[PDB]
Amino acid sequence: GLLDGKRILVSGIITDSSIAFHIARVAQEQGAQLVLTGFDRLRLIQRITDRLPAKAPLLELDVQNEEHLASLAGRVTEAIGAGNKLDGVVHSIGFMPQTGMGINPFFDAPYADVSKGIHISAYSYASMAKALLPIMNPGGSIVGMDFDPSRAMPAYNWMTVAKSALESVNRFVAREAGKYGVRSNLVAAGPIRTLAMSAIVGGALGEEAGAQIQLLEEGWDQRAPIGWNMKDATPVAKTVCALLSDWLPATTGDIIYADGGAHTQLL
Amino acid sequence: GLLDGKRILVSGIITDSSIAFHIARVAQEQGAQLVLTGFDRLRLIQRITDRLPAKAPLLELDVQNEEHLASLAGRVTEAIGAGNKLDGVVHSIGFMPQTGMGINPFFDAPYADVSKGIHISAYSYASMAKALLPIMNPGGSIVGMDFDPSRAMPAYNWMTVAKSALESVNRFVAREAGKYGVRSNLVAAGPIRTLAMSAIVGGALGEEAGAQIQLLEEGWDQRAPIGWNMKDATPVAKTVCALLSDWLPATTGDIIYADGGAHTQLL
Amino acid sequence: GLLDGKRILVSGIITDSSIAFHIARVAQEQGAQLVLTGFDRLRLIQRITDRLPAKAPLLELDVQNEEHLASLAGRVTEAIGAGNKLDGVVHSIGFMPQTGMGINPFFDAPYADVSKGIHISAYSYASMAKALLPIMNPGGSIVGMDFDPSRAMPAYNWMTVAKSALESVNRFVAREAGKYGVRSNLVAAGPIRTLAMSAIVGGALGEEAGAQIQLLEEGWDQRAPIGWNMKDATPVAKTVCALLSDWLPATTGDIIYADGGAHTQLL
Amino acid sequence: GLLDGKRILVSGIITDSSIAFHIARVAQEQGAQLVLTGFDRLRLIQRITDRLPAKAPLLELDVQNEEHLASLAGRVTEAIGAGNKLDGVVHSIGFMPQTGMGINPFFDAPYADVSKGIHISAYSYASMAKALLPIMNPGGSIVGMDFDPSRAMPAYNWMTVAKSALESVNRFVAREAGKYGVRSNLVAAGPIRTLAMSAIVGGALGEEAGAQIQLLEEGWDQRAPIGWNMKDATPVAKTVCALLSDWLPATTGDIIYADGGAHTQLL
Ligand SMILES: NC(=O)c1ccc[n+]([C@@H]2O[C@H](COP(=O)([O-])OP(=O)(O)OC[C@H]3O[C@@H](n4cnc5c(N)ncnc54)[C@H](O)[C@@H]3O)[C@@H](O)[C@H]2O)c1
Ligand SMILES: NC(=O)c1ccc[n+]([C@@H]2O[C@H](COP(=O)([O-])OP(=O)(O)OC[C@H]3O[C@@H](n4cnc5c(N)ncnc54)[C@H](O)[C@@H]3O)[C@@H](O)[C@H]2O)c1
Ligand SMILES: NC(=O)c1ccc[n+]([C@@H]2O[C@H](COP(=O)([O-])OP(=O)(O)OC[C@H]3O[C@@H](n4cnc5c(N)ncnc54)[C@H](O)[C@@H]3O)[C@@H](O)[C@H]2O)c1
Ligand SMILES: NC(=O)c1ccc[n+]([C@@H]2O[C@H](COP(=O)([O-])OP(=O)(O)OC[C@H]3O[C@@H](n4cnc5c(N)ncnc54)[C@H](O)[C@@H]3O)[C@@H](O)[C@H]2O)c1
Ligand SMILES: O=C(O)CC[N+](=O)[O-]
Ligand SMILES: O=C(O)CC[N+](=O)[O-]
Ligand SMILES: O=C(O)CC[N+](=O)[O-]
Ligand SMILES: O=C(O)CC[N+](=O)[O-]
């Protein structure tokens, strides 16, 4: 077991197509004892997570709720038991209002919506680290989900800006995490066919947006020297578990690219 | 004159130590007709800008004020004359509340403060582009002021995150600017001894923060193969004018490093 | 005149489609006094360069010839006159044997051929800097021609590896150049339809290789927010002149992208 | 066992201080069946490798020897047995003549020495890939040792250029490796006190060189949020083993930084 007898918090499960679900699944398969956090639809998330190989306590976490973050460490300690600490934390949380994405013009996205997006997608990685580092063991690992924003691309728009902010936050979280002997890193995943992506490809945020994202997917597999399967989140999940493990102990404030090596090729 | 006959909006003058003041000065020296935008203390800015080689109309622009941005293009056209468009736009605007910087711990920065900082420092570049692109000529140039946030550093904290977000926004503005035949680029300047900068070195955001920024400055000059004078904004100002000129016509969504080449050296 | 009164050595003119020819043309148009350097076919280069706006002394330089480099500074001083120094140096030199490029498998390139390519394309930038820095004025500029090798691509193969080596060498040349008050920078140009480029598209280095280069140049124009005209070297030439000028005085060991902003966009 | 049942070739053991020795050690600890390759001093290498947890066949490989590379796959197949293939390949090979490093001026390095350096340090990664990919299983992994050359630094000089070339080669090897279902990645390690490094700090390549490398070391630990122990190669070894494992299956043509996160921080 890669994560044998490691206590790992996993956020960001909403459906069985969620990357976080596949992270949670592979984590438990490798002997990790999980604490799950969920947002808004808790009855749904509890039902979805019942299909995981092992049962895991589910805590409510809205990263925009200061009370939720303030109480989180206590609620996690209650779930995993007194005198026990976290060895792992997975940030798999991302949102951007429709106005900040798709055929909705880049300039027409009002800041109130962008701010909400940056709050949930970027700042939330710092606030999660703050809440949970006090209850994290030395040799611990914090991992966030990233989408390479080094270059602008159609439709992703302000979500790309939010990911650029996240990458920057990760490098600062790493500074703080370092004091606790804890690593902080992002996995830059290739495109994964979640509900949200499938909807976007289906034209949910306008036709050209779906068209450009479908062209982006196809270009991604073409470029990737080992190919890229957008319907298979397992390679991403295994990469998150690699960073949660003891086998990247000199990597922090950094980004691991689980993208089939697409970002290393132009074509 | 590098910018002979070019009409250029220049934001972000507050004092004569402002990078924007030195941009404005060098721009006018090179035959540019300037429109100035100023925030909050207009009587002050009007007095400061009277020392510029040529007199320039000063417009009020708070980038957080929706009415100011909505009205901006009209007020600019009124100043430069009907049937006349801008050839240049300088974003020299930046702010992060005290909580987002210095010895004020990175995790203790409330999002309301970080959001206000990202609004003025990152989003404002997109909203300035939205307002002004409709009144910009083909072959035009938009330039923003950047501080390399590729790597985390002490004290700069959430301002670095704000700069990471700005870099991402610039790449998207470039996509929109391209339709108007306009270029969008950032100048990544080295540390410049502004009033706010001197205050920070003086320990205005805590002793440890001032100590770290002073060590960062000294390391910057050491690394820079052509040295770095933090008391000389002229090389930064000349670099902005180079991007405002017709002499970088194939560069857009990009970053020019006016840092003495410090970012290209480890030491 | 951007380069009025400046004495600039320009290498790498072989035909009138050469980037160096357009660099030389734009430089002379901006009041630069040129020293030209040519390889092997001197009669040809002399004839081609007669079409430049002004006549310029032509010196033989094979960068693989130690005597040519040893004697260079002397021969340049004789041409521009004793007591006069160079203000500018353009490295527009590039070669990789057929085996190092095209459908010729990457692994099948003999090192003897790769080494010849790296010698001419990468090391020669350091060689030219060594020979010429002693006869260069303070505030001077050395500029090399680059093709972004940050990501691998089809056909370019070992030429990409050579460009990666050049980028690295440039950063070290900048350290040495710094002592002389001289800047060292690369222009990362987009694809330009030179004789060799046209031949390669025509299938000169195999059909599949020509097909991939044609898809690369087409993808380049699409990505570029301000488009990319591969038949127009003028934007590249103007960018070199910008670096040779006094208007990027805080940029060294660095890379300016004259690529229509293609490298800042994914699509 | 992380590498349970995996057959892995490991090059670049010369002493027990070698990074390759620690890679080899940690690999065997994790259930890997090793083939070792050695250069020049074979009686020494056999003696050194006797201290490894398990007995491993040692094959002679000079990467500059065409006969050695042509015969390698056969000699490896003989060692691991007919109908058995490699699941892993470790390139831990690096050399640059004294003239290419230290206080020996950057410009004074003759290309013959630089070419020899680039041959062993960069090209050899492609040579090993060519020889060994035919006898490598799907889901296989090739790993090379890298020192981040993204920024120039004192003393490392042409070895940095060689590492820049290696990074570029890796991205091309990945394209070829991809056809065999094999990944190709570099581990960018922080400075490790090998016999060679200890000698350099001792002033073996001049006093100023040793002084700069000692300042680089100390700055590295300072910057690294989780610190950096240059006397501990285990974190580098564990990182190579992570890439050799099945736990980074979507990472190829890429670079993993085993540097304490030093490359993510400025200070
Ligand atoms: N799907 C892709 O193609 C892709 C690629 C790379 C990176 N990512 C990143 O992966 C992460 C996971 O997203 P996904 O693709 O699995 O989609 P998803 O919708 O399944 O996951 C997003 C999660 O964010 C949670 N969330 C939203 N707002 C929240 C809030 N205020 N507080 C707490 N949780 C909140 C949702 O409940 C959900 O569980 C995101 O950070 C996303 O940006 C996505
Ligand atoms: N000084 C440095 O060391 C340094 C280094 C690199 C980049 N920069 C960047 O240079 C730019 C200019 O800053 P500076 O260093 O000249 O300092 P400065 O204080 O002189 O300039 C900042 C400007 O931002 C303006 N501003 C603040 N809030 C605003 C708002 N809501 N609407 C409109 N304008 C607003 C201020 O009025 C001021 O004119 C900033 O973007 C800064 O981040 C600074
Ligand atoms: N054409 C493109 O698409 C493109 C794109 C970006 C960068 N570049 C770079 O621009 C530079 C100029 O090449 P180009 O595209 O104008 O083609 P070109 O063939 O016109 O220029 C190459 C030049 O190299 C010279 N040269 C070759 N071997 C030499 C040697 N041993 N000593 C001295 N000079 C030697 C040739 O004589 C010729 O003048 C090269 O470095 C090339 O890699 C080209
Ligand atoms: N030690 C560091 O500070 C450091 C940091 C990062 C990366 N690296 C890289 O790690 C790798 C291993 O080097 P090291 O630091 O363990 O030092 P080392 O001297 O122990 O290892 C170098 C190895 O290269 C081998 N070698 C030299 N020429 C060869 C040839 N022609 N054919 C085959 N093998 C040959 C030597 O026999 C030796 O085993 C190198 O690629 C090095 O650049 C070193
Ligand atoms: O967030 C991302 O990066 C993917 C966009 N999406 O489908 O939610
Ligand atoms: O804003 C910056 O990037 C630096 C100057 N400052 O205000 O601290
Ligand atoms: O060298 C280059 O980058 C392009 C010139 N060429 O070989 O076609
Ligand atoms: O090879 C390296 O990068 C480490 C320097 N050294 O001691 O050989």
mmCIF file of C-alpha atoms in Angstrom, chain D residues 12-14 37-42 44-45 58-65 68 93 95 116 120:
data_model
loop_
_atom_site.group_PDB
_atom_site.id
_atom_site.type_symbol
_atom_site.label_atom_id
_atom_site.label_comp_id
_atom_site.label_asym_id
_atom_site.label_seq_id
_atom_site.Cartn_x
_atom_site.Cartn_y
_atom_site.Cartn_z
ATOM 1 C CA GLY D 12 26.420 6.209 -13.497
ATOM 2 C CA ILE D 13 27.753 4.442 -10.327
ATOM 3 C CA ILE D 14 31.500 5.295 -9.831
ATOM 4 C CA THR D 37 26.317 -0.263 -16.327
ATOM 5 C CA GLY D 38 29.807 1.145 -15.488
ATOM 6 C CA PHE D 39 32.400 3.355 -17.295
ATOM 7 C CA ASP D 40 36.225 2.877 -17.425
ATOM 8 C CA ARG D 41 37.062 1.773 -13.802
ATOM 9 C CA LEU D 42 35.054 -1.531 -13.726
ATOM 10 C CA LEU D 44 36.274 -0.226 -8.703
ATOM 11 C CA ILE D 45 32.529 -0.075 -9.691
ATOM 12 C CA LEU D 58 27.542 -5.028 -14.109
ATOM 13 C CA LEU D 59 27.897 -4.353 -17.905
ATOM 14 C CA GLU D 60 30.598 -1.972 -19.314
ATOM 15 C CA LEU D 61 29.053 1.132 -21.032
ATOM 16 C CA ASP D 62 31.107 4.076 -22.380
ATOM 17 C CA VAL D 63 28.276 6.200 -23.965
ATOM 18 C CA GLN D 64 30.943 7.695 -26.363
ATOM 19 C CA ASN D 65 31.654 4.100 -27.635
ATOM 20 C CA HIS D 68 29.220 -0.505 -26.490
ATOM 21 C CA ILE D 93 25.774 10.047 -16.475
ATOM 22 C CA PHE D 95 30.869 14.914 -17.516
ATOM 23 C CA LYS D 116 32.818 15.929 -25.311
ATOM 24 C CA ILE D 120 28.327 12.375 -22.377
#
